[PDB]
Structure formats: C-alpha cells, structure tokens
Design a protein around this ligand. Structure first.
Ligand SMILES: C[S@+](CC[C@H](N)C(=O)O)C[C@H]1O[C@@H](n2cnc3c(N)ncnc32)[C@H](O)[C@@H]1OP(=O)(O)OC[C@H]1O[C@@H](n2cnc3c(N)ncnc32)[C@H](O)[C@@H]1O
Ligand SMILES: [Mn+2]
Length: 251
C-alpha cells in the first residue's frame, strides 16, 4: 500500500508533520491551510486522482469532510468524538514507524495537552516558551495579535468564581491563553465566536447544543481541554446567552 497525506490547518504540530513527511520521501499535499479553512475539498483534485485507486491509502490530517471521502481515505483526527486520541503528529508518526525525538514529543504534548502536557513529560521553562512561541508563529499570530491580546486582558476581562471571561476583538485567541496561564477556566468571546478552555467541557457542550447544531462546535484537548464555536455561525445574542449560561455554572 502506498501513502498519500493531505494536510489540514497549520500549527507547530502540522509543521513537524511536514518535516517528517519530507524526510521520509512520502507523497503529500500541503495547501498552506489554516484552522478555519481545513476543508477536504481544498484537495478535490487529489481526491479525484487517487480516490478509490487501488494501491493508495489517502490520509486526511485534520480535514473537515465537506465532500464525501472515497473508500481508500482514512481520517486522522483528535477532535470531537476523537478528542481523547493522540495528536495527529503522533498518529502520523505511528503510521510511518517514525520514533519521535525529544523536541517532537514536546510538540505533540503541547498540541494535545498544551502547557500541562509539556510539564508532565518534564519540559523546562525555556522549552515551554520556545514551543509556545513557535506554535503561535505557525498559527500566523503577529504583533497586532499580541497587542490586542494584552488590551483584552487589561480592559475586557472579568473573573467570576474560577472563570475568567475575556471579551476581545482579536483575530487569534492563543496569545490570550498564553498571557493568562495558569488558570482553571477561561472563556474568550467576540460578537460572533467563543472558545472555552479548562475544567468541565462536557457541561459546556450541553449548553452549546441548546443553541446550535453540532456542526458549529469543535472540542479537543481532553477532559479539561477546549470547546468552541465556528466563527460567524452564531449571532451576538446567541453568544451572549451562552456566556451567561457558562457564568451560571460558577453558582
Ligand atoms: C484551541 S485552538 C484556538 C483557535 C482559535 N480560532 C484562535 O483564534 O486561536 C483551536 C482548535 O480548534 C480547532 N478547530 C476546529 N475547527 C475550527 C474552526 N472552524 N476554526 C478554528 N479552529 C478550529 C483547531 O484545529 C484547533 O485545534 P488543534 O488541535 O489543531 O490545535 C490545538 C491548539 O490549541 C493548543 N491547545 C491544546 N490544548 C489546549 C488547552 N487545553 N488550552 C489551550 N490551548 C490548547 C495547542 O497547543 C494547539 O496550538
Ligand atoms: Mn492541528
């Protein structure tokens, strides 16, 4: 069986996947996608060419199946119903019998379980900082993202019980998490988007499903990971109601 890898949205783990695939002479396609455009249809041409074509197995790495996969397609993912699975990076390495070196295992732990993940395999303070900086960079965060993050923390943050609630107009949320960490619970929202981080995502999922179909929701990172809504799918009043419901859990 011959492998073809189709890559989803970029971050440090996806960049590490590119390196391993490049080193191992694997057939792969990388359209420089991001978290909010990682659609299988970005690779429609490749699906037409290799789909249902006997020798090949097509591995889709964190791609939304907006078109019907062919019979030789395998989804590689660790979100939603697969939120307990290892990072896509670890799954790809296993497919290729690739032993992850130390840096790569830190990348994988950060990708699946953030700073807590890196701490439980003994990452140092310098290692954690390099990984976070390189992850934000691979996501495309820039200076104006980091500036808006500081603004939201100074002027748009309030703490209710153990829950931080941050209103922001920032495009990228990861700079906010990295500035507020450590925290137990964090809710970041905009007029048309929210992401919740930390303890008890399952009760957050119960709230979200009263307002929107599951196709507008994503989660991962484990029991106390993250759960969010796809940008511009919910109205401001729906977001505001959800925010109130999440605050009520602190009572
Ligand atoms: C938590 S991140 C924040 C995205 C947010 N849009 C932003 O602006 O920064 C978003 C995750 O949701 C996924 N996602 C799915 N669909 C969409 C969509 N339509 N729009 C946006 N995001 C979508 C996306 O792939 C990513 O998962 P990943 O697994 O690829 O990456 C996880 C990232 O979060 C970090 N992370 C992992 N666990 C945690 C945690 N518990 N707390 C904070 N960060 C974590 C990890 O280091 C890595 O950088
Ligand atoms: Mn990813």
């Amino acid at each position: 069986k011959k492998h073809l890898f189709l890559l989803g949205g970029h971050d440090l783990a996806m960049q590490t996947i590119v390196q391993i695939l490049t080193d191992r002479n694997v057939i792969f396609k990388d359209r420089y996608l991001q978290w909010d455009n990682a659609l299988l249809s970005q690779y429609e041409e490749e699906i037409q060419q290799y789909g249902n074509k006997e020798p090949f197995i097509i591995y889709g790495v964190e791609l939304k199946e907006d078109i019907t996969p062919p019979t030789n397609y395998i989804r590689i993912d660790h979100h939603n119903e697969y939120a307990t699975y290892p990072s896509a990076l670890e799954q790809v390495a296993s497919i290729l019998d690739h032993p992850l070196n130390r840096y790569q295992t830190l990348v994988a732990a950060n990708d699946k379980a953030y700073i807590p993940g890196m701490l439980e395999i003994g990452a140092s303070h310098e290692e954690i900082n390099l990984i976070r900086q390189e992850d934000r960079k691979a996501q495309g965060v820039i200076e104006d993202d980091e500036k808006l993050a500081q603004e939201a923390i100074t002027n748009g943050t309030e703490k209710i019980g153990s829950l931080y609630v941050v209103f922001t107009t920032a495009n990228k949320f990861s700079p906010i998490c990295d500035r507020l960490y450590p925290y137990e619970k964090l809710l970041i929202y905009t007029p048309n988007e929210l992401i919740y981080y930390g303890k008890g995502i399952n009760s957050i999922q119960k709230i979200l499903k009263r307002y929107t179909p599951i196709s507008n929701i994503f989660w991962g990172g484990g029991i106390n990971g993250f759960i969010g809504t796809v940008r511009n799918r919910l109205t401001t009043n729906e977001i505001l109601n959800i925010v109130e419901q999440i605050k009520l859990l602190e009572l």
